[PDB]
Design a protein around this ligand. Sequence first.
Ligand SMILES: OC[C@H]1O[C@@H](O[C@H]2[C@H](O)[C@@H](O)[C@H](O[C@H]3[C@H](O)[C@@H](O)[C@H](O[C@H]4[C@H](O)[C@@H](O)[C@H](O)O[C@@H]4CO)O[C@@H]3CO)O[C@@H]2CO)[C@H](O)[C@@H](O)[C@@H]1O
Ligand SMILES: OC[C@H]1O[C@@H](O[C@H]2[C@H](O)[C@@H](O)[C@H](O)O[C@@H]2CO)[C@H](O)[C@@H](O)[C@@H]1O
Ligand SMILES: [Ca+2]
Length: 697
Amino acid sequence: DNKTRFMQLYEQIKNPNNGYFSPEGIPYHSVETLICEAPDYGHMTTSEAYSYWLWLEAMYGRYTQDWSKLEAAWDNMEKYIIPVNNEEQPTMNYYNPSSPATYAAEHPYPDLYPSALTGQYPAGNDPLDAELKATYGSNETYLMHWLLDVDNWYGFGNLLNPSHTAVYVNTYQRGEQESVWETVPHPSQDNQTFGKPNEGFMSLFTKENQAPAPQWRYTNATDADARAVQAMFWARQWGYSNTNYLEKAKKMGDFLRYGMYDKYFQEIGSAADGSPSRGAGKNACHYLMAWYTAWGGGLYANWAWRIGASHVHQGYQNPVASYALSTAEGGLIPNSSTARSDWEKALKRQLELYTWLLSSEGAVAGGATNSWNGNYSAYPQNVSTFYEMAYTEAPVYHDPPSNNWFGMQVWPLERVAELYYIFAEKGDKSSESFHMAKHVIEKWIAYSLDYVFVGERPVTDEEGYYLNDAGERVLGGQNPQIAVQSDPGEFWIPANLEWSGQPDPWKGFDSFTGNPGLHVTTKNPSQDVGVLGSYIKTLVFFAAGTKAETGGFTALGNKAKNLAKELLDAAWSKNDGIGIAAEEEHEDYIRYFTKEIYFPNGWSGRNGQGNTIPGPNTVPSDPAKGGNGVYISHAELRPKIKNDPMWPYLENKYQTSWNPNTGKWENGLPTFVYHRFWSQVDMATAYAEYDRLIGNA
Ligand SMILES: OC[C@H]1O[C@@H](O[C@H]2[C@H](O)[C@@H](O)[C@H](O[C@H]3[C@H](O)[C@@H](O)[C@H](O[C@H]4[C@H](O)[C@@H](O)[C@H](O)O[C@@H]4CO)O[C@@H]3CO)O[C@@H]2CO)[C@H](O)[C@@H](O)[C@@H]1O
Ligand SMILES: OC[C@H]1O[C@@H](O[C@H]2[C@H](O)[C@@H](O)[C@H](O)O[C@@H]2CO)[C@H](O)[C@@H](O)[C@@H]1O
Ligand SMILES: [Ca+2]
């Protein structure tokens, strides 16, 4: 019974004995501590985790009409991860929207940081600051910072909220090649008690004529605040009506418009020729969710700044949130003058983006940028464009390429499927937006069905390629034949994509005739339960949408709902009492041992435990990467990780299995079972939404 399964999994997630939450009531990234993949420690947490917590409590409210849990989750989010009687953005009022920030270039290796604050390109004007002040009386940013150190494992302490154990921390600072393995974690509120004397951590990342001042700064993740809005959209659809909290979700959707702006508010398209123009009015708005917005200031401090982001990843867009923020049906139109219009344009533009990126096979390709190379380089000749933004197959990050993970298929396509259903349910079956959502989800669903297996396991070679009955690699194509073997009670879902080509230039939906030069190979079957739970919701919302549109399930809708039912049954067999549990192998945990964390020469500082970094065990940086410094490895930067209960296993596996000459694990791979918060919520909400939308059909 899928309602009972939802409630059982809910109970497991909320059970204090299972370890998903800290003593402060904050959800961790994962129950387990030794994990490194986006946060670099399992008891960090993310705005992502909070947004999933809201989604979980909204579904609990639907069944029980007990909305006190959703409100407690919102309160806890606001207390610990939205930095709004403690002033956590203490100089935001000094922000100058006519000069929002000082330009610095991004660089292709972390080696090349700190980046000079040259001001080479004057920032354009910020058209939101005045409206937001008019609406709220303050420009204090109501968005989640993306990263907390929940247990104060890094030891920085919480500068601006003394009673909290959880600390605002950040990591990524140094461009497209700085993987999770390559950062230097640092406090968001840096008064220079840690880092380099009289400088803090700032001088790893930016250079000025003079030592940096103490400063605070935050960065959101736009997909997380949008998911929070998506959860509140659903809560209201399911009966929630407390205006005190709905107004907070509106305010978050209002400030989330900062993720619609070019990084330095340069006019969209203006640097196609390598020479940007400072934006004016709303002409630096691209009406998409770019990777972040960030804001910061001094800690006699009298200055503050904001940046949008120029790089857009399709997997961050949330059309349900955009619908929620632009329509009376959605109920969360923000109070600022132009917020409704902005989100209305954004919803349409997001659907155009997905159509533009729809590959020949059916997966959606990466995204687009207004700042080629992160320094407003001229666009390569013949690069495909979308509203004068240049196609990028790997938005923002190249290590690993950010659209190679299949999780960035199910996460956005789940929302496109939701919107398809939402449009059809109210009787919109003919708008251009409906037609784009419908086309994208139909094609994607049909794509995905070739690569997801239940009760059987696909045949693959050692590099992860699916094989056909002749033992040939399945390299995309429309009608792949994949050899299978029996695997009762198991499921297999891709983890990886390999891209080639580009979409045709976008000239509007009326001109769209496919992307026959854009191809993808799907590979690396996995048992990722989080990707699975997102996929099952995608199947269920798509199926429900075909019924709301046509009056019954289509042939493809039937396939989708039937596969969802079987996947939910197979996954339930893997519940271990803490969560849906599957082994996973980690090739990449060799990077717990690699000397690849860059520090500039001459830079020495104090970490949060008082330990000197980088310390003595350095090697020089790669000259080919243009730096002038050194590398250390993970546990040299983070010596506490050697005390983890799983560290001996991992270290012994490295010393007995890793072959440096071949670059391969030859006596077993590092193998883990993780209970990630977001993954367990994706699963739980899949049981619930199958119950709601398919029921006994
Ligand atoms: O020049 C003005 C101003 O710049 C400040 O430096 C900025 C950088 O310009 C900016 O690129 C950098 O952005 C980081 C961000 O801080 C990280 O939080 C973010 O991490 C992402 C992560 O990549 C995702 O995997 C995860 O999902 O979400 C987080 C949140 O989005 O990565 C981006 C880069 O990709 O942030 C700096 C601010 O901290 C200077 O510090 C300042 O002095 C200048 O005045
Ligand atoms: O950065 C995207 C997303 O990654 C999640 O970790 C993924 C990882 O990127 C993928 O390589 C591995 O195979 O699967 C894990 C678990 O799904 C991470 O948990 C998210 O926080 C993060 O947003
Ligand atoms: Ca790298």
